[PDB]
């Protein structure tokens, strides 16, 4: 989520060991590192064009993506730089030979390279433990908004 200020903490936000020599007069001020997480996920330009710092970003930060790759729909965006998705699924009861609707809510970190709204289907990649509960990271937005601009005024 981040937005504005970027240098808004008590500590200086920077990328580890990405020294920029001040002697060397340069036109871009800050040298910035990045990668592609692989598995086929484009490292969106807003990660390379970005100036945010998030060490928990899978493109600009020091996290690796491995283990389960999951999709689920976004249902909470109130946590600064993280969200809560719901993954629905039917569950088979034998004896009755039918299923029942179930769900779980997975908490997952979301880098300022994505701009996620409630309702967006999102794909996340499993993580090293990143917080008390978050074990996933938003790796791609599948959605958009859900035709919001096609909710405008009158003729």
């Amino acid at each position: 989520s981040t937005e504005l200020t970027v240098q808004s903490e008590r500590a200086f936000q920077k990328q580890p060991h990405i020294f920029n020599n001040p002697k060397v007069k340069t036109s871009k001020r800050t040298k910035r590192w990045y990668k592609n997480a692989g598995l086929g996920f484009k490292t969106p330009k807003t990660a390379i064009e970005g100036s945010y710092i998030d060490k928990k970003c899978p493109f600009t930060g020091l996290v690796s993506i491995r283990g389960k790759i999951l999709t689920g729909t976004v249902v909470s965006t109130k946590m600064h730089r993280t969200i809560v998705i719901r993954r629905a699924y039917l569950h088979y009861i034998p004896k009755y030979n039918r299923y029942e609707k179930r769900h779980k809510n997975v908490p997952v970190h979301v880098s300022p390279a994505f701009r996620v709204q409630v309702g967006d289907i999102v794909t996340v990649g499993q993580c090293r433990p990143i917080s008390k509960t978050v074990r996933f990271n938003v790796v791609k937005v599948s959605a958009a908004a859900a035709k919001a601009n096609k909710q405008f005024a009158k003729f």
């Binding site: 240098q7 903490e9 008590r10 500590a11 200086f12 920077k14 020294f19 920029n20 020599n21 001040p22 002697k23 060397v24 001020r29 800050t30 908490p107 008390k132 509960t133």
Partner: protein, 188 residues
């Protein structure tokens, strides 16, 4: 012993979780080195599987490196002047990683003038060559030159003294330096 299990601590629902098993050692924690300044005192602590961790308590020298100058010297550590985590660390001059310290400058002076032939602030054959070789490269930087006058340089502890018994850092440069300077004075 301090335990770092998650088995206490409510679950995301807010549930209270019954105690399953007694504390294990392998999930242990220990108390902070809260390392201070002056006169070497280091206590080695025996960690999991052989392995020593070195607890610093009191330290006066540390190895500090001017990055854009490509060198490292070991200076006295003058004191702690800003800490992003806690002010009691600054007030009580506690050395931890990320602490901003002041160091000594006169090793970073002795080297500079002996490598550039310029002197900050304000006759050999080969040296004259070398000194004249360098420059267009001696041009330092305003807010780092001005610090040598004072005799003290701003530098961020970059190691973990409570772990390695080393209190090591880098001189504050460019962006970073400006940052902490802005903080330093708009609170001074």
């Amino acid at each position: 012993g301090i335990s770092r299990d998650s088995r206490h601590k409510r679950s995301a629902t807010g549930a209270k979780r019954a105690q399953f098993r007694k504390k294990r050692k392998f999930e242990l924690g220990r108390q902070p080195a809260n390392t201070k300044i002056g006169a070497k005192r280091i206590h080695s602590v025996r960690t999991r599987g052989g392995n020593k961790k070195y607890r610093a308590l009191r330290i006066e020298t540390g190895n500090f490196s001017w990055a854009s100058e490509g060198i490292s010297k070991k200076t006295r550590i003058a004191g702690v002047v800003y800490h992003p985590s806690n002010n009691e660390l600054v007030r009580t001059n506690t050395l931890t990683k990320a602490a901003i310290v002041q160091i000594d400058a006169t090793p970073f002076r002795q080297w500079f003038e002996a490598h550039y032939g310029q002197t900050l602030g304000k006759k050999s054959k080969n040296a004259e060559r070398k000194w004249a070789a360098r420059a267009a490269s001696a041009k330092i930087e305003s807010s780092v030159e001005s610090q040598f006058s004072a005799g003290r340089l701003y530098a961020c502890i970059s190691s973990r003294p409570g772990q390695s018994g080393r209190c090591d850092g880098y001189i504050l440069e460019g962006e970073e330096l400006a940052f902490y300077l802005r903080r330093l004075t708009a609170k001074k």
